[PDB]
Scaffold this active site. Structure first.
Site, PDB file in Angstrom:
ATOM      1  N   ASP A 236       0.927  -0.958   0.065  1.00  0.00           N
ATOM      2  CA  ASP A 236       0.013  -0.034  -0.129  1.00  0.00           C
ATOM      3  C   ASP A 236       0.876   1.379   0.102  1.00  0.00           C
ATOM      4  O   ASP A 236       1.959   1.360   0.610  1.00  0.00           O
ATOM      5  CB  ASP A 236      -0.883   0.024   1.245  1.00  0.00           C
ATOM      6  CG  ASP A 236      -1.741  -1.223   1.447  1.00  0.00           C
ATOM      7  OD1 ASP A 236      -1.528  -2.254   0.791  1.00  0.00           O
ATOM      8  OD2 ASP A 236      -2.538  -1.064   2.330  1.00  0.00           O
TER       9      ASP A 236
ATOM     10  N   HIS B 247      -0.989   4.599  -0.663  1.00  0.00           N
ATOM     11  CA  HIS B 247      -1.860   5.579  -0.129  1.00  0.00           C
ATOM     12  C   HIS B 247      -1.402   7.267  -0.257  1.00  0.00           C
ATOM     13  O   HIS B 247      -1.586   7.905   0.909  1.00  0.00           O
ATOM     14  CB  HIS B 247      -2.182   5.259   1.456  1.00  0.00           C
ATOM     15  CG  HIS B 247      -3.223   4.019   1.611  1.00  0.00           C
ATOM     16  ND1 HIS B 247      -4.481   3.902   0.996  1.00  0.00           N
ATOM     17  CD2 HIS B 247      -3.069   2.889   2.440  1.00  0.00           C
ATOM     18  CE1 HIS B 247      -4.877   2.991   1.464  1.00  0.00           C
ATOM     19  NE2 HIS B 247      -4.035   2.171   2.309  1.00  0.00           N
TER      20      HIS B 247
ATOM     21  N   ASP C 197      -3.925   0.290  -3.737  1.00  0.00           N
ATOM     22  CA  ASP C 197      -3.913   0.992  -2.616  1.00  0.00           C
ATOM     23  C   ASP C 197      -3.249   2.501  -2.979  1.00  0.00           C
ATOM     24  O   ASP C 197      -2.006   2.623  -2.257  1.00  0.00           O
ATOM     25  CB  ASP C 197      -4.116   0.591  -1.398  1.00  0.00           C
ATOM     26  CG  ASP C 197      -5.239  -0.121  -1.006  1.00  0.00           C
ATOM     27  OD1 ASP C 197      -6.178  -0.210  -1.711  1.00  0.00           O
ATOM     28  OD2 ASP C 197      -5.395  -0.371   0.061  1.00  0.00           O
TER      29      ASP C 197
ATOM     30  N   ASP D 122      -5.959   7.618  -1.437  1.00  0.00           N
ATOM     31  CA  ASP D 122      -6.703   7.757  -0.042  1.00  0.00           C
ATOM     32  C   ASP D 122      -5.505   8.076   1.258  1.00  0.00           C
ATOM     33  O   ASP D 122      -4.511   7.504   0.873  1.00  0.00           O
ATOM     34  CB  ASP D 122      -7.623   6.448   0.081  1.00  0.00           C
ATOM     35  CG  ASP D 122      -9.043   6.467  -0.594  1.00  0.00           C
ATOM     36  OD1 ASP D 122      -9.295   7.601  -1.220  1.00  0.00           O
ATOM     37  OD2 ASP D 122      -9.632   5.450  -0.644  1.00  0.00           O
ATOM     38  N   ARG D 123      -6.148   8.629   2.028  1.00  0.00           N
ATOM     39  CA  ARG D 123      -5.330   8.858   3.378  1.00  0.00           C
ATOM     40  C   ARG D 123      -4.109   9.886   3.088  1.00  0.00           C
ATOM     41  O   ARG D 123      -4.348  10.914   3.730  1.00  0.00           O
ATOM     42  CB  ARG D 123      -4.733   7.631   3.705  1.00  0.00           C
ATOM     43  CG  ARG D 123      -4.634   7.587   5.262  1.00  0.00           C
ATOM     44  CD  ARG D 123      -5.899   7.478   6.123  1.00  0.00           C
ATOM     45  NE  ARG D 123      -6.425   6.197   6.198  1.00  0.00           N
ATOM     46  CZ  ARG D 123      -7.609   5.904   6.695  1.00  0.00           C
ATOM     47  NH1 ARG D 123      -8.553   6.685   7.009  1.00  0.00           N
ATOM     48  NH2 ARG D 123      -8.262   4.583   6.529  1.00  0.00           N
TER      49      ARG D 123
ATOM     50  N   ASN E 248      -8.325  -2.412  -2.668  1.00  0.00           N
ATOM     51  CA  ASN E 248      -9.793  -2.259  -2.185  1.00  0.00           C
ATOM     52  C   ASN E 248     -10.007  -0.592  -2.358  1.00  0.00           C
ATOM     53  O   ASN E 248     -11.388  -0.249  -2.123  1.00  0.00           O
ATOM     54  CB  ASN E 248      -9.963  -2.678  -1.032  1.00  0.00           C
ATOM     55  CG  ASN E 248      -9.481  -2.162   0.159  1.00  0.00           C
ATOM     56  OD1 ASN E 248      -8.035  -2.217   0.161  1.00  0.00           O
ATOM     57  ND2 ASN E 248     -10.145  -2.006   1.325  1.00  0.00           N
ATOM     58  N   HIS E 249      -9.111   0.217  -2.361  1.00  0.00           N
ATOM     59  CA  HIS E 249      -9.198   1.642  -2.477  1.00  0.00           C
ATOM     60  C   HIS E 249      -9.463   2.308  -3.905  1.00  0.00           C
ATOM     61  O   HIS E 249      -9.650   3.415  -4.087  1.00  0.00           O
ATOM     62  CB  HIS E 249      -8.091   2.385  -1.916  1.00  0.00           C
ATOM     63  CG  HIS E 249      -8.134   2.583  -0.294  1.00  0.00           C
ATOM     64  ND1 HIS E 249      -8.505   3.198   0.745  1.00  0.00           N
ATOM     65  CD2 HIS E 249      -7.803   1.310   0.378  1.00  0.00           C
ATOM     66  CE1 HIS E 249      -8.760   2.937   1.716  1.00  0.00           C
ATOM     67  NE2 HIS E 249      -8.267   1.720   1.791  1.00  0.00           N
TER      68      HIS E 249
ATOM     69  N   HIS F  99      -4.047  -8.012  -3.509  1.00  0.00           N
ATOM     70  CA  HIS F  99      -4.013  -7.032  -2.697  1.00  0.00           C
ATOM     71  C   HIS F  99      -4.507  -7.398  -1.340  1.00  0.00           C
ATOM     72  O   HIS F  99      -3.945  -7.037  -0.377  1.00  0.00           O
ATOM     73  CB  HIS F  99      -4.812  -5.745  -3.091  1.00  0.00           C
ATOM     74  CG  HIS F  99      -4.992  -4.864  -2.012  1.00  0.00           C
ATOM     75  ND1 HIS F  99      -3.945  -4.011  -1.814  1.00  0.00           N
ATOM     76  CD2 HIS F  99      -5.968  -4.497  -1.086  1.00  0.00           C
ATOM     77  CE1 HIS F  99      -4.320  -3.112  -0.845  1.00  0.00           C
ATOM     78  NE2 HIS F  99      -5.536  -3.352  -0.338  1.00  0.00           N
TER      79      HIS F  99
ATOM     80  N   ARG G 280     -13.523  -6.075   9.763  1.00  0.00           N
ATOM     81  CA  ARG G 280     -13.830  -4.978   8.765  1.00  0.00           C
ATOM     82  C   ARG G 280     -15.173  -4.901   8.552  1.00  0.00           C
ATOM     83  O   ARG G 280     -15.681  -3.692   7.934  1.00  0.00           O
ATOM     84  CB  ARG G 280     -12.911  -4.726   7.567  1.00  0.00           C
ATOM     85  CG  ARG G 280     -11.491  -5.042   7.821  1.00  0.00           C
ATOM     86  CD  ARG G 280     -10.722  -5.070   6.346  1.00  0.00           C
ATOM     87  NE  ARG G 280      -9.499  -5.454   6.525  1.00  0.00           N
ATOM     88  CZ  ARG G 280      -8.423  -4.547   6.361  1.00  0.00           C
ATOM     89  NH1 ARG G 280      -8.653  -3.222   6.249  1.00  0.00           N
ATOM     90  NH2 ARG G 280      -7.140  -5.109   6.211  1.00  0.00           N
TER      91      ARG G 280
ATOM     92  N   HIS H  25      -2.386  -4.666   2.156  1.00  0.00           N
ATOM     93  CA  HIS H  25      -3.742  -4.394   2.671  1.00  0.00           C
ATOM     94  C   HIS H  25      -3.813  -4.282   4.159  1.00  0.00           C
ATOM     95  O   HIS H  25      -4.829  -3.907   4.866  1.00  0.00           O
ATOM     96  CB  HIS H  25      -4.644  -5.419   2.279  1.00  0.00           C
ATOM     97  CG  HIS H  25      -6.191  -5.392   2.540  1.00  0.00           C
ATOM     98  ND1 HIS H  25      -7.111  -4.250   2.712  1.00  0.00           N
ATOM     99  CD2 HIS H  25      -7.006  -6.459   3.054  1.00  0.00           C
ATOM    100  CE1 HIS H  25      -8.077  -4.403   3.109  1.00  0.00           C
ATOM    101  NE2 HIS H  25      -8.094  -5.825   3.305  1.00  0.00           N
TER     102      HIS H  25
END
Lengths: 294, 22, 7
Positions: A58, A60, A86, A89-90, A118-119, A167, A215, A242
């Site tokens: 990841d 991000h 990923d 995001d973030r 997943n992002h 992922h 989750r 992940h």
């Protein structure tokens, strides 16, 4: 599409203040999305790759950390890369991060590979930062262009018929690699089923077989699931991402699975390094770790 | 040849690069 | 800890 100019402007921040933005034009970004989307669709959804390769987890939107990873591992095409998803995001610079990765995919399409995380999903990145970044720096229409591109990313990769990469993790639905190959693109990520699990599931040492996932989506799997999967498919290793892990990499199930996470100091609960896994031509694996100095 | 890890043969498993965020 | 969709 002036690819070399885009990459050059993206790499001009190299050495400058961490956080300074590259404001490419909307047309340039849309061009990256459309051309990369064509390349993703022209390549299999289950990639068949050969070592040597560097594998990253990841990111991000930690753009300067991505540049440090390339500095340490070698900038394309001196090293071949597989990223596990990923990208957005973030972080503060999802746009620079994804744009450089898509540019390298266009520039070196046979030596540079990106899987879906997943992002890379509108339901997630609408909440977790990428929608907001697109709306602030560009517009909502560009965010939708990214979604159409992400909907075409491949889902898994097998390195030299021996390392299975995705992922998230395994799925209780997955008996044959053909099930992955039969997924058609473009596709959204569903909240249940094989594709969901490949992007969302997690290993858990306290589960016997398959278990629930805290989750609220997908499943957890234990060490025996890993061993059975490897034996059934004549594989040696699962490589996935992940989850934040303290050293940037972490083994599970007697070195039969490794988790990679490539965004240093991602969380507030603990410091973490970012790691890449280097796979040499003989399939000997080692880790390159980026650790904050303090 | 099976997947292996570098510490199987006397190499470092990991290499660490420390960085200053700025 | 950032919120389990994920420290």
């Amino acid at each position: 599409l002036n690819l070399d100019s885009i990459i050059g402007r993206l790499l001009e921040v190299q050495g400058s203040r961490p956080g300074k933005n590259v404001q490419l034009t909307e047309n340039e970004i849309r061009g990256l999305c459309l051309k990369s989307r064509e390349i993703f669709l022209s390549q299999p959804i289950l990639l068949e790759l050969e070592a040597p390769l560097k594998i990253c987890g990841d990111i991000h939107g930690q753009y300067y950390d991505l540049l440090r990873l390339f500095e340490y591992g070698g900038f394309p095409p001196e090293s071949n890369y597989l990223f596990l998803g990923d990208y957005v995001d973030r972080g503060k610079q999802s746009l620079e991060t994804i744009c450089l990765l898509l540019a390298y995919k266009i520039k070196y399409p046979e030596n540079f590979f990106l899987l879906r995380g997943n992002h890379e999903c509108a339901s997630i990145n609408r909440i977790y930062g990428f929608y907001d970044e697109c709306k602030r720096r560009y517009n909502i229409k560009l965010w939708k262009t990214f979604t159409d591109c992400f909907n075409c990313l491949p889902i898994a990769a097998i390195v030299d018929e021996k390392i299975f990469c995705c992922h998230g993790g395994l799925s209780p639905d997955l008996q044959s690699m053909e099930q992955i190959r039969r997924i058609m693109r473009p596709t959204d990520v569903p909240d249940q089923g094989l594709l969901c699990d490949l992007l969302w599931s997690d290993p858990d040492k306290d589960v016997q077989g398959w278990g629930e996932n805290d989750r609220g989506v997908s499943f957890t799997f234990g060490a025996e699931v890993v061993a059975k999967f490897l034996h059934k498919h004549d594989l040696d290793l699962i490589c996935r991402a992940h989850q934040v892990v303290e050293d940037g990499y972490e083994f599970f199930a007697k070195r039969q699975l490794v988790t990679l996470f490539s965004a240093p100091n991602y969380c507030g609960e603990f410091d973490n390094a970012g790691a890449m896994m280097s796979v040499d031509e003989t399939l000997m694996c080692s880790f390159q770790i980026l650790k904050p100095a303090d | 040849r099976r997947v292996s890890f570098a510490d199987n043969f006397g190499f470092n498993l990991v290499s660490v690069k420390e960085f200053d965020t700025w | 800890x950032l919120x389990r969709x994920x420290x």
